[PDB]
Amino acid sequence: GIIEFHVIGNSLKANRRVLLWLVGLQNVFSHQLPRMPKEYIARLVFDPKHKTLALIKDGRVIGGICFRMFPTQGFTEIVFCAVTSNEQVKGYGTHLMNHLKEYHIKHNILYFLTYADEYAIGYFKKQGFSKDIKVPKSRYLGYIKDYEGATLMECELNPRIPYT
Amino acid sequence: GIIEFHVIGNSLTNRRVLLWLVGLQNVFSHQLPRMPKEYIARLVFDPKHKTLALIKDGRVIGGICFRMFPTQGFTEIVFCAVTSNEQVKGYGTHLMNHLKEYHIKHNILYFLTYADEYAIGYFKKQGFSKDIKVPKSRYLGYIKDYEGATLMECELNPRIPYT
Amino acid sequence: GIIEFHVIGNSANRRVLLWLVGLQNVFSHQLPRMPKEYIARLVFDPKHKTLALIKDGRVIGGICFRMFPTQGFTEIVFCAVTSNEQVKGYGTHLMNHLKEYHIKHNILYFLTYADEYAIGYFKKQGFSKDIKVPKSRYLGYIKDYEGATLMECELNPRIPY
Amino acid sequence: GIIEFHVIGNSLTANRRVLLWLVGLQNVFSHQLPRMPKEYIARLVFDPKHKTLALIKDGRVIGGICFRMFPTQGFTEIVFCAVTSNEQVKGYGTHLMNHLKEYHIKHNILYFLTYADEYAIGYFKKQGFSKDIKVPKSRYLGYIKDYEGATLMECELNPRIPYT
Amino acid sequence: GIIEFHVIGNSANRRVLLWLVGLQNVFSHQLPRMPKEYIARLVFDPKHKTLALIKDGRVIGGICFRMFPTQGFTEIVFCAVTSNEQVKGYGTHLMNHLKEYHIKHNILYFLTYADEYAIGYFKKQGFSKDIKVPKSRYLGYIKDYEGATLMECELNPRIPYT
Amino acid sequence: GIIEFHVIGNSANRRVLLWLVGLQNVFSHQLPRMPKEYIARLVFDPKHKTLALIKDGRVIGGICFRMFPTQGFTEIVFCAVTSNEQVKGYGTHLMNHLKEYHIKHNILYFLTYADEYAIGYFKKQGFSKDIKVPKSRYLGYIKDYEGATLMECELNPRIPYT
Amino acid sequence: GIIEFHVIGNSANRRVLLWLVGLQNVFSHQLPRMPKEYIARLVFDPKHKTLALIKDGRVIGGICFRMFPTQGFTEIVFCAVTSNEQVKGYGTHLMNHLKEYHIKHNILYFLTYADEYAIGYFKKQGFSKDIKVPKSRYLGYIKDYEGATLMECELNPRIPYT
Amino acid sequence: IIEFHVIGNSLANRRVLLWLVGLQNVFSHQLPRMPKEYIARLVFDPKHKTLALIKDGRVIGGICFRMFPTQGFTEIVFCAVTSNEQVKGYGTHLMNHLKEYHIKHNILYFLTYADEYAIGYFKKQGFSKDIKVPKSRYLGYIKDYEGATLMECELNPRIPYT
């Protein structure tokens, strides 16, 4: 029924409603990324410097995008994207990415970086990510986790068009 | 009439100021029909952006919106405009001249901008060139990219008074 | 006896203070042509950190280093194990703990100048003379040193847990 | 008489003695660098990001080196350099350069960069400066003030030598 | 070049801290039979002070000492001059500055334990093997050292020492 | 199990208070010819401290002591390890920790009045019947229990004890 | 008669102050050849305390004393019971209560200068002319009157005195 | 008009400062073998006090002294009466006033060093060469003077000295 989008995180205080949403997001990420260790997912989701765009359907977490903004560096690292299995192929992934794009325009961070594996690179291509990295290697080598084996990809946002 | 220059911006600490940015957003938007109004308003009212307001008789008639990147050593030129009935009188040059002198006093000596085919001439007349000495590694991801426009650069001489 | 590893630096505690002195002692005694005052300046410099190796409350070796996150590498400044405790794998455990620490912090490159007395130790830790970090990335950040050989180690990234 | 070296500047929080020394230094820089507009020297010498090493003899400023530390880039820019004409060719300029080196040794900065006229290049050569610039252009362009026409020069410090 | 004397100690700024390291280095190198860790613990102990001898910004000697005002004496803990600066009067100059310092703080007795290689230096600074301070006043306060000689210096507060 | 050491005493929270009660029971049970009220008074006395030995949250032994920093020594008052944890080195690790703690406070002499069942243990810890501390520094600060042997341990501050 | 024991001293309450006047009166009447001004100075001295014997609200005797914790003893300054209440055990109960009170303050030695009229009473309270406290601990702290006998009492912290 | 005031530089108004300078002047002129900078340091020391003798607002004499209440005695530091007020009993009145002062502060011993030119003044004030205060209580607290004679005065607290 009712769909909500919210950008949340564990600030250095957390609504009980927020704390349960964060557990829900860790649950979803963990289940949809089974070889990603759950303790690692938990630490990023609950890290103050990370934020997560929660997708709420009838008060229940059904998807998210966890990310770390690097405003000093001019980009944001996408850490986890996931929709729960029985809600996939319904466009939720696309509305999530769009909402994330809207959120970043309004904070003048205009570049996404992410590692895309073989299971989801096709989704990132359809959201405009390419393998041509325009951000200088020196801007991100020390900041994003290197998921060697997976393909580094980049999205450039246009701050002049509406995404939501 | 009387002509005054003032550097203003949306602080985090006025009404004469606020009304002037509204006017500048108005003029910027009318002279730049391809820049969406909301995008102009978002940048013009962003606190890290400043605008060199040109004013004739209490009325905003021109401005240069800009964004100082002092950690990077350059200022980004964001918007330039002179209201239509006041063009070809030298206001565009006095605004650039004033923006130059102001940047000498804050020891920022490089301007970067993107120019479409219709504005490249104006910037060339203000001393901008297509040859970019500032490295990509310093500006990409900090200045707004504009694919399909030409990146232009101006170098300032601090031993020279511009105004 | 008991073995501890601790990454420490000047802010601190009295415990950390006396460890930094022990490290400055170990570095200075094993590198006697370094000026004593220069080692102390770096060990107590707050953008340097030192990995300390402790045996029964005692400094018996360490590695002092400078991280450059904006450049994706870390400079290794001093490595020393006290004489009585050398040739026991302690140098290897130090470098292994240093490697783990840097993988957790997303820095996958070590740069260091090695001399003729210790280049082989660095070789056995996977360092080589082939420098893949661009010169434009480390020039002016690491203390260049004519008469010594710049070496590089590349680490493999790892997902924690 | 008595000689004193002091690293001084217009900082966050002023001293009456420091202020007058700063006026004195701006006077000496202007009188010895005529091509530099006196008002340009003034705003640099009083800029908080700039420091000046003052050479004091008998309470009176007779020389100085104005410099801008760029620690995130690894070098220091030497901005002005002057000894009052009455005190030149007595080794004061060397002593000044030596103290500035020692000061930078203790602050773990080991490169100097400066633009020198044909008139002054000899003095910097004798302080160990070289036309061979080993810092990449990407590291200093837009940070040091360009003087097109003058020669860019670099001095490398050894943190193991006692310069004072 | 420029000689300077400073009484310092832990309690804390970078210059003092690097000086304390410098004193620890000089003590430890000139007293090889003293554990480096022990020297470091006492030099950096807040009830311990050190009179540091500064030549052109570098530490070239000092005297680490422990004032016992309730007991009426100071314990000399370490004295050293760096090898290349010795036999130039620096050791005598350090002790004189230490005596002058203690006059103004109204402590007029020094106590130290000297091994056979150090007795001569203390004798020439006016120390004696005749101990006037009673055992009940110093035992358990100063660190005793079996095998070394306890020596004592009495100061004249009516005399300019420096 | 998990073994901890805590220096505690009265001045306050309940875990400490139950530890102090356990110490009182252990001391009292191991030393039954000593009035229980007297042990309790001393353990809860604010000028007294106890080094507690904890095994799985429970008190299995300790050393109750009285620091006299003005007199330059500490008095060992009670030493006890519970009966089933004896002859395993806990009594020695307790004394060792107590030694390390006193070196940090520049108290280098322990004194104790040992009975005939305890002298062997104190000798193993380096105590001796040769008292170097003069009578005038300890008489009346510690009670001379008739028939008990005065014993002294001197601590070496250059050495690690734990 | 309702008997009470209170340890009191100056530096305030109305009842305490009238008790102190009453103690100055009893001490002075029972010791007529000691100047009443000197008794008052001591009784009201803030470093002096008095253990007061109270019968039906009225002061009928007491012991004025000076605790010297730094020196590890207490000086007995005056003892008196009013004449109508002598030879009924009051002086013994006072001294017993004084002993208990010093036991819980870790002071185990009393020193006093008895005159010829009071040596018998002090002997019955366990005082001896054999002084174990060394002279250096008490001389100049307690007042030595020519013609008085220094006597000493050693307390046992394991004995219940009251 | 004669006046007696106990004064000191206790961490002083203008009147007290000029009296202290007056006393430094008088002591300096009457004890010319004391360095005038030494007299100044002691007279102005916050732990020292001086009993001033004032005549028509003017300083004509005094006794500078240092109270050691921890040690149970006081050190007589300087004694002087200006030359044209001498042999009038002013110096006796001063010592008596100082005695009265010390009884009300429960200090009963004076210690001082006297050369031959001064021993007879102190003998007339009740000082003896037989020292009862033990060496462990004064050595390193009072200022030694080799070649002078250590003298002692025992005061009696039941005697009004003024």
Ligand SMILES: CC(C)(COP(=O)(O)OP(=O)(O)OC[C@H]1O[C@@H](n2cnc3c(N)ncnc32)[C@H](O)[C@@H]1OP(=O)(O)O)[C@@H](O)C(=O)NCCC(=O)NCCSC(=O)CC(=O)O
């Ligand atoms: C990838 C998803 C989050 C996408 O969410 P949705 O299923 O709601 O997608 P959507 O409905 O909005 O579809 C948008 C378009 O992408 C296409 N598409 C192509 N490949 C796809 C793929 N592998 N997964 C999902 N969609 C894919 C769809 O056909 C559709 O095409 P069209 O519109 O033309 O019809 C989900 O599949 C998921 O949770 N997967 C498991 C988790 C995962 O792999 N996450 C990324 C890991 S890599 C990474 O960076 C780590 C991380 O983020 O977790």
Ligand SMILES: CC(C)(COP(=O)(O)OP(=O)(O)OC[C@H]1O[C@@H](n2cnc3c(N)ncnc32)[C@H](O)[C@@H]1OP(=O)(O)O)[C@@H](O)C(=O)NCCC(=O)NCCSC(=O)CC(=O)O
């Ligand atoms: C460009 C202007 C700001 C210049 O204003 P003025 O007319 O007051 O300037 P001026 O009178 O000093 O003209 C100086 C000289 O410039 C020369 N000239 C040549 N080409 C020109 C050009 N395209 N625009 C303006 N002047 C131009 C003219 O010959 C003129 O006369 P002579 O040569 O004889 O001396 C204005 O014309 C204007 O508002 N234009 C529309 C808005 C715009 O295009 N802004 C720039 C892009 S925004 C931007 O900054 C980048 C971005 O956001 O992407």
Ligand SMILES: CC(C)(COP(=O)(O)OP(=O)(O)OC[C@H]1O[C@@H](n2cnc3c(N)ncnc32)[C@H](O)[C@@H]1OP(=O)(O)O)[C@@H](O)C(=O)NCCC(=O)NCCSC(=O)CC(=O)O
């Ligand atoms: C270099 C050391 C820290 C190494 O410590 P250890 O002795 O504990 O090494 P280790 O026991 O773990 O030995 C691991 C492997 O290295 C091999 N090996 C080869 N050459 C070696 C050499 N020159 N020194 C030490 N080990 C060496 C050993 O045979 C062994 O091989 P295998 O196990 O396969 O049989 C120590 O030797 C030392 O403190 N030396 C003096 C200080 C010094 O020279 N420092 C480096 C300065 S240059 C520099 O870059 C700055 C700095 O580091 O200070």
Ligand SMILES: CC(C)(COP(=O)(O)OP(=O)(O)OC[C@H]1O[C@@H](n2cnc3c(N)ncnc32)[C@H](O)[C@@H]1OP(=O)(O)O)[C@@H](O)C(=O)NCCC(=O)NCCSC(=O)CC(=O)O
């Ligand atoms: C350059 C000076 C600061 C040097 O000071 P001193 O006169 O005290 O020099 P000194 O006594 O220490 O001697 C240094 C040695 O260098 C040699 N030498 C060679 N060329 C020289 C030159 N142009 N000026 C001074 N010395 C020079 C001299 O022979 C000398 O002796 P020997 O040969 O025997 O060893 C001063 O001369 C001066 O203030 N000049 C005017 C201002 C100026 O030009 N400043 C520098 C430019 S500032 C600049 O352009 C860079 C910047 O902007 O920061």
Ligand SMILES: CC(C)(COP(=O)(O)OP(=O)(O)OC[C@H]1O[C@@H](n2cnc3c(N)ncnc32)[C@H](O)[C@@H]1OP(=O)(O)O)[C@@H](O)C(=O)NCCC(=O)NCCSC(=O)CC(=O)O
């Ligand atoms: C002893 C020193 C501090 C003295 O320093 P200096 O050499 O500068 O002294 P100086 O130049 O003033 O010498 C003054 C005179 O003393 C005489 N002299 C006698 N013995 C001497 C000795 N062992 N070393 C130096 N001088 C000595 C010399 O004849 C000399 O010349 P003349 O007679 O002609 O005038 C130094 O030599 C040193 O650092 N030694 C190693 C450390 C040490 O032994 N420290 C003392 C123990 S530490 C301590 O305090 C106790 C403890 O650790 O328990």
Ligand SMILES: CC(C)(COP(=O)(O)OP(=O)(O)OC[C@H]1O[C@@H](n2cnc3c(N)ncnc32)[C@H](O)[C@@H]1OP(=O)(O)O)[C@@H](O)C(=O)NCCC(=O)NCCSC(=O)CC(=O)O
């Ligand atoms: C005394 C103890 C605290 C010792 O504790 P531990 O049993 O844990 O001792 P440990 O295992 O660490 O050390 C054992 C070593 O000491 C030697 N040893 C010799 N005589 C001993 C003796 N009477 N008790 C214990 N050990 C003794 C053993 O041969 C052995 O030799 P090796 O060297 O080969 O290993 C305990 O036995 C105990 O609680 N006893 C009853 C209480 C008591 O008597 N306390 C002291 C009272 S007098 C006092 O001043 C304190 C007090 O009042 O309680």
Ligand SMILES: CC(C)(COP(=O)(O)OP(=O)(O)OC[C@H]1O[C@@H](n2cnc3c(N)ncnc32)[C@H](O)[C@@H]1OP(=O)(O)O)[C@@H](O)C(=O)NCCC(=O)NCCSC(=O)CC(=O)O
């Ligand atoms: C000593 C004085 C303070 C005494 O003062 P007055 O003159 O007022 O003495 P007075 O009138 O009260 O008593 C005089 C009586 O003392 C006797 N008498 C014996 N020897 C004397 C002596 N050496 N000095 C003064 N009086 C002396 C006389 O016979 C006379 O006898 P009769 O009794 O029958 O009347 C003064 O003389 C003085 O200022 N002297 C110079 C300073 C000085 O020497 N101060 C003492 C040392 S300072 C110190 O404290 C020592 C140190 O620190 O080393």
